[PDB]
């Protein structure tokens, strides 16, 4: 009977929450028990969807959201079609304009330690990394932020509004520490 859950349900649009429930249950975690992961997964989802919305109509292939096996199917097809090494871990998008997988991150710490953590998690150099924070800062690999400043700004505004909403419901600190 958690209220982080009711907040996540009133804050994100129903297809985000449906996909997040799908993705957490697929990895054996309960949205109703670990509600703060739930919130994080909706946030990651929505940020990715805004990010794909940011380019031109054919620029991005979306990997997040899909079922793990079809996600790997599309990754495989992108590899065997483009000539890019199959990433060790499932990415988030593929940039046809820039010929590279994109890994998106949303951190409640700051830019840095998350960027280094993911970069050494991947450590295969090929796939692009792009992190945002709940405080408006951002970073992509090689200072190549991929999108134009206004789309990324829209993302940051959304992230800070979510932070504000959680804080006003006093859920922000608990979300921050985990």
Ligand X SMILES: C[C@H](C[C@@H](C[C@H](C[C@@H](C[C@@H](CCN1CCCC1=O)N1CCCC1=O)N1CCCC1=O)N1CCCC1=O)N1CCCC1=O)N1CCCC1=O
Ligand Y SMILES: COc1cc(CCNC(=O)c2nc(C(C)(C)NC(=O)OCc3ccccc3)[nH]c(=O)c2O)ccc1O
List residues forming the annotated binding site for Mg(2+): 10, 44, 64, 92, 103-104
Site track for ligand Y across 12-51, x = CB under 6 A:
-----------xx--x-x-------x--xx--x-------
Angstrom distance (rounded) from CA 100 to CA 126: 7
Question: Is residue 118 annotated as a catalytic residue, yes or no?
Answer: yes
23 binds, among ligand X, ligand Y, Mn ion, none (CB under 5 to 8 A by kind): ligand Y
Fill in the per-residue mask, 91 to 110: x = in contact with Mn ion (CB under 5 A), - = not in contact. -x-----------x------
Q: Is 88 a catalytic residue?
A: no
Main-chain dihedrals φ then ψ at residue 134, nearest 5 degrees: -75, 10
- The whole-angstrom separation of Cα 67 and Cα 167 is 32
**CB-CB neighbours of 174 under 10 Å:** 13
**Residue 104 vs 171, nearer CB to ligand Y:** 104
CA distance 156 to 162: 10
**Tally of CB atoms within 10 A around 74:** 14
Q: Which residues are catalytic?
A: 64, 92, 118
């Amino acid at each position: 009977g958690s209220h982080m859950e009711d907040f996540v349900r009133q804050c994100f649009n129903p297809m985000i929450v449906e996909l997040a429930e799908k993705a957490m249950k697929e990895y054996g975690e309960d949205p109703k028990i670990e509600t703060n992961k739930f919130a994080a997964i909706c946030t990651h989802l929505e940020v990715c969807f805004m990010y794909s919305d940011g380019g031109s109509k054919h620029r991005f292939e979306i990997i997040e959201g899909r079922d793990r096996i079809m996600a790997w199917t599309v990754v495989n097809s992108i590899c065997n079609t483009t000539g890019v090494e199959k990433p060790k871990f499932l990415p988030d998008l593929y940039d046809y304009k820039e010929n590279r997988f994109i890994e998106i991150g949303v951190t409640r710490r700051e830019v840095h330690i998350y960027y280094l953590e993911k970069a050494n998690k991947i450590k295969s150099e090929k796939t692009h990394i792009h992190i945002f924070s709940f405080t408006g800062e951002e970073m992509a690999t090689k200072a190549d932020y991929t999108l134009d400043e206004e789309s990324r700004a829209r993302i940051k505004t959304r992230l800070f509004t979510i932070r504000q909403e959680m804080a006003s419901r006093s859920l922000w600190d608990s979300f921050r520490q985990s």
